[PDB]
Amino acid sequence: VTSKMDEIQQLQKALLDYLDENTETDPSLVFSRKFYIAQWFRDTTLETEKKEIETTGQIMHRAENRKKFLRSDTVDYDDACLIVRYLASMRPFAQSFDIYLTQILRVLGENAIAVRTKAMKCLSEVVAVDPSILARLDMQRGVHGRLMDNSTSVREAAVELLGRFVLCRPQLAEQYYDMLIERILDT
DNA sequence: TTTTTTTTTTTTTTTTTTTTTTTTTTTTTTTTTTTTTTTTTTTTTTTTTTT
């Protein structure tokens, strides 16, 4: 939330020149260079796996990789930061968070108290980092269920979540106020 | 007298420790059941004693 708001091969070339200069500046950078090389190699093969059109494309790709490894201007630091951020944002990691969330909701129905308590508490932390996530209907029904759950621990965790979320975003809190202030008499 | 230097006191910040509180789990004394054994009492026959 604080970051986002054939050319790819040319970018790979540019990053290689950046690191190449930094080899002169400081040792151990050669290891990083070889590591990036291997990672590009395996990523092209793994996308290849999913054909003859991309077969010819990847054989020029991979041959260029072999050549360019054998081959061991003016681009600098911030540029390198933004390029590698972009190329990482292409990788199958930045679009993983969503998946992770789903996993968490599998936990909420379980047969052990402590795990559910801690899950709810960490979720409270999660939402209090990014306040615009109480939109997906499944999480809504989750926090409702846990508000009606049959154990005092998860009950206090849930009410703490809902209260901190209400406190953070000043307006738009009159929609949770009723379900909140119902809960005072909870034994 | 005034300027320059030293020291003590007061107050705020922080960090570590302590206390508190609830909750959940555990393991223990407490409580009840059943049995059952002992001991006291009972009986009846045997033994002793009396006319």
Resolution for this PDB entry, in angstroms:
5.3
Which two tokens mark A39? Answer: 């990672």
End-to-end CA distance of chain A: give it in Å, rounded.
Answer: 40
Q: What does DSSP assign to residue A71?
A: T
Rounded to whole angstroms, the distance from the CA of residue A12 to the C1' of nucleotide B12 is: 55
Q: Which amino acid is at A128?
A: A
Q: Quick check: A153 CB within 7 A of strand B?
A: yes
Which two tokens mark A143? Answer: 């926090």
CB A123 within 8 Å of CB A104: yes
Distance of CA A142 to the CA centre of its chain: 22
Residues 87-116 of A with CB under 7 A from strand B: 113
Distance of CA A3 to the CA centre of its chain: 11
Minimum-distance nucleotide, CA of A152 to C1': B23
Secondary structure (3-state) at A78: helix
CA angle A131, A132, A137 (to 5 degrees): 115
| H helix runs in A71-131, sequence order | 77-90, 97-107, 113-129
Experimental method: cryo-EM
Secondary structure (3-state) at A4: coil
CB A133 within 8 Å of CB A104: no
Residues 6+ apart with CB under 8 A from A1: A130
Minimum-distance nucleotide, CA of A151 to C1': B23
Distance CA A105, CA A93 (A): 20
Residue A74 region, left (φ>0) first, then alpha (ψ -120 to 50), else beta? Answer: left
CB A19 within 8 Å of CB A32: yes
Rounded to whole angstroms, the distance from the CA of residue A159 to the C1' of nucleotide B22 is: 16
Q: Which nucleotides of B are covered by protein (CB under 7 A)?
A: 22-25
Minimum-distance nucleotide, CA of A153 to C1': B23
Q: Quick check: A151 CB within 7 A of strand B?
A: yes
Q: What does DSSP assign to residue A127?
A: H
